[PDB]
Design an enzyme around this catalytic site. Structure first.
Site, short mmCIF file in Angstrom:
data_model
loop_
_atom_site.label_atom_id
_atom_site.label_comp_id
_atom_site.label_asym_id
_atom_site.label_seq_id
_atom_site.Cartn_x
_atom_site.Cartn_y
_atom_site.Cartn_z
N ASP A 199 -7.67 17.37 19.33
CA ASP A 199 -6.97 17.59 20.60
C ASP A 199 -5.72 16.71 20.77
O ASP A 199 -5.82 15.53 21.13
CB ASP A 199 -7.99 17.32 21.71
CG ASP A 199 -7.49 17.64 23.10
OD1 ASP A 199 -6.33 18.09 23.29
OD2 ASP A 199 -8.28 17.43 24.04
N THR A 200 -4.55 17.31 20.55
CA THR A 200 -3.25 16.63 20.71
C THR A 200 -2.96 16.33 22.19
O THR A 200 -2.11 15.52 22.53
CB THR A 200 -2.12 17.51 20.14
OG1 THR A 200 -2.17 18.79 20.76
CG2 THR A 200 -2.30 17.74 18.69
N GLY A 201 -3.69 16.99 23.08
CA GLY A 201 -3.51 16.75 24.51
C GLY A 201 -4.48 15.69 25.04
O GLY A 201 -4.57 15.47 26.24
C1 LIG Z 1 -11.02 14.19 27.82
C2 LIG Z 1 -9.80 14.22 27.00
C3 LIG Z 1 -8.69 13.31 27.53
C4 LIG Z 1 -9.30 12.07 28.17
C5 LIG Z 1 -7.79 14.04 28.56
N1 LIG Z 1 -7.05 15.21 28.03
C6 LIG Z 1 -7.39 16.48 28.21
O1 LIG Z 1 -8.40 16.86 28.82
C7 LIG Z 1 -6.40 17.50 27.62
N2 LIG Z 1 -6.97 18.50 26.68
C8 LIG Z 1 -7.92 19.46 27.26
C9 LIG Z 1 -9.07 19.53 26.26
O2 LIG Z 1 -9.55 18.21 26.02
C10 LIG Z 1 -10.22 20.36 26.81
C11 LIG Z 1 -11.35 20.35 25.80
C12 LIG Z 1 -12.54 21.08 26.26
C13 LIG Z 1 -12.85 22.31 25.71
C14 LIG Z 1 -13.91 23.05 26.20
C15 LIG Z 1 -14.66 22.55 27.26
C16 LIG Z 1 -14.35 21.31 27.80
C17 LIG Z 1 -13.30 20.58 27.30
N3 LIG Z 1 -9.78 21.74 27.05
C18 LIG Z 1 -9.39 22.18 28.24
O3 LIG Z 1 -9.42 21.45 29.27
O4 LIG Z 1 -9.02 23.45 28.26
C19 LIG Z 1 -8.44 23.97 29.46
C20 LIG Z 1 -7.23 23.16 29.85
C21 LIG Z 1 -7.99 25.37 29.14
C22 LIG Z 1 -9.50 24.01 30.58
C23 LIG Z 1 -5.64 18.18 28.77
C24 LIG Z 1 -5.23 17.22 29.85
C25 LIG Z 1 -4.22 16.26 29.62
C26 LIG Z 1 -3.95 15.28 30.54
C27 LIG Z 1 -4.69 15.23 31.73
C28 LIG Z 1 -5.67 16.17 31.99
C29 LIG Z 1 -5.93 17.15 31.05
O5 LIG Z 1 -4.50 14.24 32.67
C30 LIG Z 1 -4.08 13.02 32.09
C31 LIG Z 1 -5.21 12.00 32.02
C32 LIG Z 1 -5.58 11.69 30.58
N4 LIG Z 1 -6.61 12.61 30.13
C33 LIG Z 1 -6.65 13.07 28.88
O6 LIG Z 1 -5.81 12.77 28.02
#
Ligand SMILES: CC[C@H](C)[C@@H]1NC(=O)[C@@H](NC[C@@H](O)[C@H](Cc2ccccc2)NC(=O)OC(C)(C)C)Cc2ccc(cc2)OCCCNC1=O
Lengths: 99, 99
Positions: free
Chosen positions: B25-27
Protein backbone atom coordinates in the site's frame (compact mmCIF):
# COMPACT_ATOMS: atom_id res chain seq x y z
CA UNK A 1 7.43 9.04 -14.05
CA UNK A 2 9.17 6.85 -11.46
CA UNK A 3 7.96 7.90 -8.01
CA UNK A 4 9.85 6.91 -4.87
CA UNK A 5 8.12 6.44 -1.51
CA UNK A 6 10.15 8.57 0.95
CA UNK A 7 7.24 10.96 0.79
CA UNK A 8 3.54 10.38 0.21
CA UNK A 9 3.01 9.91 -3.54
CA UNK A 10 0.89 13.04 -4.05
CA UNK A 11 0.24 14.38 -7.56
CA UNK A 12 -2.09 16.95 -9.15
CA UNK A 13 -5.26 15.78 -10.87
CA UNK A 14 -7.92 17.63 -12.84
CA UNK A 15 -11.47 16.53 -12.10
CA UNK A 16 -14.71 18.37 -12.84
CA UNK A 17 -12.56 21.02 -14.50
CA UNK A 18 -10.85 21.60 -11.14
CA UNK A 19 -7.23 20.85 -9.96
CA UNK A 20 -6.67 18.87 -6.73
CA UNK A 21 -3.91 16.93 -4.96
CA UNK A 22 -4.38 13.21 -4.73
CA UNK A 23 -2.59 10.19 -3.32
CA UNK A 24 -1.66 7.29 -5.67
CA UNK A 25 -2.86 4.46 -3.49
CA UNK A 26 -2.23 0.86 -4.59
CA UNK A 27 -4.02 -0.37 -1.47
CA UNK A 28 -7.24 1.25 -2.67
CA UNK A 29 -9.56 -0.74 -4.94
CA UNK A 30 -11.51 2.45 -5.70
CA UNK A 31 -10.98 6.17 -6.10
CA UNK A 32 -12.42 8.29 -3.26
CA UNK A 33 -12.51 12.12 -3.60
CA UNK A 34 -13.39 14.70 -0.93
CA UNK A 35 -16.90 16.20 -1.09
CA UNK A 36 -17.39 18.32 -4.18
CA UNK A 37 -20.00 19.07 -6.83
CA UNK A 38 -19.47 16.87 -9.80
CA UNK A 39 -21.65 17.10 -12.83
CA UNK A 40 -23.63 13.94 -13.42
CA UNK A 41 -26.01 11.53 -11.70
CA UNK A 42 -24.92 9.60 -8.62
CA UNK A 43 -25.92 6.47 -6.71
CA UNK A 44 -25.45 6.20 -2.95
CA UNK A 45 -22.88 3.55 -2.00
CA UNK A 46 -21.00 2.28 1.08
CA UNK A 47 -17.30 1.41 1.22
CA UNK A 48 -15.06 0.45 4.10
CA UNK A 49 -11.41 0.87 4.89
CA UNK A 50 -9.30 0.55 8.08
CA UNK A 51 -11.49 2.44 10.53
CA UNK A 52 -14.84 1.43 9.10
CA UNK A 53 -17.56 2.06 6.51
CA UNK A 54 -18.54 5.48 5.21
CA UNK A 55 -21.37 6.53 2.89
CA UNK A 56 -20.30 7.88 -0.55
CA UNK A 57 -21.93 9.19 -3.72
CA UNK A 58 -20.94 7.13 -6.73
CA UNK A 59 -20.27 9.01 -10.01
CA UNK A 60 -19.60 6.85 -13.07
CA UNK A 61 -17.49 7.39 -16.18
CA UNK A 62 -15.92 10.62 -14.85
CA UNK A 63 -12.86 11.88 -16.79
CA UNK A 64 -9.87 12.42 -14.49
CA UNK A 65 -6.43 13.60 -15.62
CA UNK A 66 -3.63 12.26 -13.40
CA UNK A 67 -0.24 13.93 -14.01
CA UNK A 68 -1.30 14.64 -17.57
CA UNK A 69 -2.58 11.09 -18.19
CA UNK A 70 -6.25 10.60 -18.91
CA UNK A 71 -8.55 8.06 -17.24
CA UNK A 72 -12.36 7.95 -17.42
CA UNK A 73 -13.92 5.92 -14.66
CA UNK A 74 -15.87 5.62 -11.43
CA UNK A 75 -15.10 8.10 -8.66
CA UNK A 76 -16.65 7.97 -5.14
CA UNK A 77 -17.18 11.32 -3.34
CA UNK A 78 -17.43 11.34 0.42
CA UNK A 79 -15.80 12.27 3.73
CA UNK A 80 -12.09 11.48 3.34
CA UNK A 81 -8.86 12.76 4.89
CA UNK A 82 -7.28 12.90 1.43
CA UNK A 83 -8.13 12.42 -2.29
CA UNK A 84 -7.30 8.81 -3.13
CA UNK A 85 -6.61 7.52 -6.62
CA UNK A 86 -7.27 3.78 -6.44
CA UNK A 87 -6.55 0.76 -8.65
CA UNK A 88 -9.51 1.33 -10.97
CA UNK A 89 -7.80 4.49 -12.35
CA UNK A 90 -4.16 3.49 -11.78
CA UNK A 91 -4.64 0.58 -14.20
CA UNK A 92 -6.00 2.92 -16.88
CA UNK A 93 -2.77 5.01 -16.78
CA UNK A 94 -0.61 1.91 -16.72
CA UNK A 95 0.80 2.31 -13.21
CA UNK A 96 2.86 -0.60 -11.89
CA UNK A 97 4.73 -1.38 -8.66
CA UNK A 98 8.42 -2.13 -9.19
CA UNK A 99 11.25 -3.24 -6.87
CA UNK B 1 9.62 -7.68 -10.10
CA UNK B 2 6.89 -5.55 -11.69
CA UNK B 3 3.43 -5.82 -10.15
CA UNK B 4 0.42 -4.84 -12.24
CA UNK B 5 -2.66 -3.47 -10.50
CA UNK B 6 -5.40 -5.54 -12.16
CA UNK B 7 -5.66 -7.29 -8.78
CA UNK B 8 -4.78 -6.17 -5.23
CA UNK B 9 -0.95 -6.24 -4.99
CA UNK B 10 -0.76 -9.05 -2.39
CA UNK B 11 2.58 -10.63 -1.59
CA UNK B 12 3.99 -13.05 1.01
CA UNK B 13 5.84 -11.53 3.95
CA UNK B 14 7.56 -13.20 6.89
CA UNK B 15 7.29 -11.68 10.29
CA UNK B 16 7.89 -13.09 13.73
CA UNK B 17 8.65 -16.45 12.24
CA UNK B 18 5.39 -16.58 10.33
CA UNK B 19 4.46 -16.30 6.66
CA UNK B 20 1.48 -14.04 5.82
CA UNK B 21 -0.11 -12.45 2.76
CA UNK B 22 0.02 -8.66 2.77
CA UNK B 23 -1.08 -5.77 0.58
CA UNK B 24 1.54 -3.38 -0.79
CA UNK B 25 0.00 0.00 0.00
CA UNK B 26 1.68 3.18 -1.35
CA UNK B 27 -1.10 5.16 0.34
CA UNK B 28 -0.18 3.86 3.80
CA UNK B 29 2.20 5.91 6.00
CA UNK B 30 2.66 2.86 8.30
CA UNK B 31 2.68 -0.94 8.22
CA UNK B 32 -0.34 -2.59 9.91
CA UNK B 33 -0.35 -6.31 10.66
CA UNK B 34 -3.34 -8.32 11.80
CA UNK B 35 -3.51 -9.20 15.48
CA UNK B 36 -0.62 -11.49 16.43
CA UNK B 37 1.24 -12.24 19.61
CA UNK B 38 4.58 -10.67 18.83
CA UNK B 39 6.90 -10.53 21.82
CA UNK B 40 8.52 -7.25 22.71
CA UNK B 41 7.82 -3.91 24.33
CA UNK B 42 5.20 -1.82 22.53
CA UNK B 43 3.64 1.62 22.82
CA UNK B 44 -0.04 2.40 22.23
CA UNK B 45 -1.17 4.41 19.24
CA UNK B 46 -4.14 5.28 17.04
CA UNK B 47 -3.97 5.32 13.25
CA UNK B 48 -6.70 6.53 10.97
CA UNK B 49 -7.82 5.36 7.61
CA UNK B 50 -11.05 5.86 5.66
CA UNK B 51 -13.89 5.52 8.16
CA UNK B 52 -11.96 6.41 11.27
CA UNK B 53 -9.25 5.41 13.75
CA UNK B 54 -8.30 2.08 15.31
CA UNK B 55 -6.09 1.36 18.33
CA UNK B 56 -2.89 -0.50 17.60
CA UNK B 57 0.29 -1.52 19.39
CA UNK B 58 3.53 -0.11 18.02
CA UNK B 59 6.55 -2.43 17.87
CA UNK B 60 9.90 -1.08 16.68
CA UNK B 61 12.76 -2.69 14.81
CA UNK B 62 10.79 -5.72 13.75
CA UNK B 63 12.43 -7.78 11.00
CA UNK B 64 10.05 -8.40 8.08
CA UNK B 65 11.01 -10.14 4.86
CA UNK B 66 8.96 -8.94 1.85
CA UNK B 67 8.94 -11.08 -1.29
CA UNK B 68 12.38 -12.32 -0.27
CA UNK B 69 13.58 -8.76 0.45
CA UNK B 70 14.81 -7.93 3.96
CA UNK B 71 13.59 -4.89 5.88
CA UNK B 72 13.25 -3.77 9.48
CA UNK B 73 11.18 -1.09 11.09
CA UNK B 74 8.07 -0.17 12.99
CA UNK B 75 5.06 -2.49 12.70
CA UNK B 76 1.66 -1.66 14.19
CA UNK B 77 -0.47 -4.63 15.38
CA UNK B 78 -4.21 -4.23 15.57
CA UNK B 79 -7.60 -5.35 14.31
CA UNK B 80 -7.19 -4.86 10.54
CA UNK B 81 -9.05 -6.93 7.93
CA UNK B 82 -5.80 -7.27 5.93
CA UNK B 83 -2.05 -6.99 6.52
CA UNK B 84 -0.78 -3.69 5.01
CA UNK B 85 2.85 -2.94 4.07
CA UNK B 86 3.23 0.83 4.12
CA UNK B 87 5.90 3.23 2.81
CA UNK B 88 8.11 2.86 5.93
CA UNK B 89 8.99 -0.64 4.74
CA UNK B 90 8.44 -0.17 0.95
CA UNK B 91 11.26 2.38 0.71
CA UNK B 92 13.56 -0.20 2.27
CA UNK B 93 12.99 -2.70 -0.54
CA UNK B 94 13.42 -0.04 -3.23
CA UNK B 95 9.80 -0.08 -4.37
CA UNK B 96 8.66 2.61 -6.80
CA UNK B 97 5.47 3.63 -8.61
CA UNK B 98 5.95 3.87 -12.36
CA UNK B 99 3.69 5.10 -15.20
C1 LIG C 1 -4.01 1.95 7.76
C2 LIG C 1 -3.09 2.40 6.71
C3 LIG C 1 -2.52 3.80 6.96
C4 LIG C 1 -2.33 4.03 8.46
C5 LIG C 1 -3.44 4.92 6.38
N1 LIG C 1 -3.61 4.88 4.91
C6 LIG C 1 -4.67 4.40 4.27
O1 LIG C 1 -5.64 3.87 4.83
C7 LIG C 1 -4.63 4.55 2.75
N2 LIG C 1 -4.81 3.31 1.95
C8 LIG C 1 -6.12 2.67 2.04
C9 LIG C 1 -5.83 1.18 2.21
O2 LIG C 1 -4.95 1.01 3.31
C10 LIG C 1 -7.10 0.41 2.49
C11 LIG C 1 -6.75 -1.05 2.71
C12 LIG C 1 -7.90 -1.89 3.04
C13 LIG C 1 -8.43 -2.77 2.11
C14 LIG C 1 -9.58 -3.48 2.38
C15 LIG C 1 -10.21 -3.32 3.61
C16 LIG C 1 -9.68 -2.45 4.55
C17 LIG C 1 -8.53 -1.74 4.27
N3 LIG C 1 -8.04 0.53 1.37
C18 LIG C 1 -9.03 1.41 1.35
O3 LIG C 1 -9.28 2.17 2.32
O4 LIG C 1 -9.77 1.39 0.25
C19 LIG C 1 -10.76 2.40 0.06
C20 LIG C 1 -10.13 3.77 0.13
C21 LIG C 1 -11.32 2.20 -1.32
C22 LIG C 1 -11.88 2.23 1.11
C23 LIG C 1 -5.64 5.63 2.33
C24 LIG C 1 -5.62 6.83 3.24
C25 LIG C 1 -4.53 7.72 3.26
C26 LIG C 1 -4.44 8.71 4.20
C27 LIG C 1 -5.46 8.85 5.16
C28 LIG C 1 -6.55 8.01 5.15
C29 LIG C 1 -6.63 7.00 4.20
O5 LIG C 1 -5.40 9.80 6.16
C30 LIG C 1 -4.08 10.09 6.55
C31 LIG C 1 -3.70 9.44 7.87
C32 LIG C 1 -2.61 8.39 7.68
N4 LIG C 1 -3.23 7.10 7.41
C33 LIG C 1 -2.67 6.23 6.58
O6 LIG C 1 -1.62 6.45 5.95
Amino acid sequence: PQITLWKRPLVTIRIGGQLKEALLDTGADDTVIEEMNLPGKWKPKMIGGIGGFIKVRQYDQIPVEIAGHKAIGTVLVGPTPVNIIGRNLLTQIGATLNF
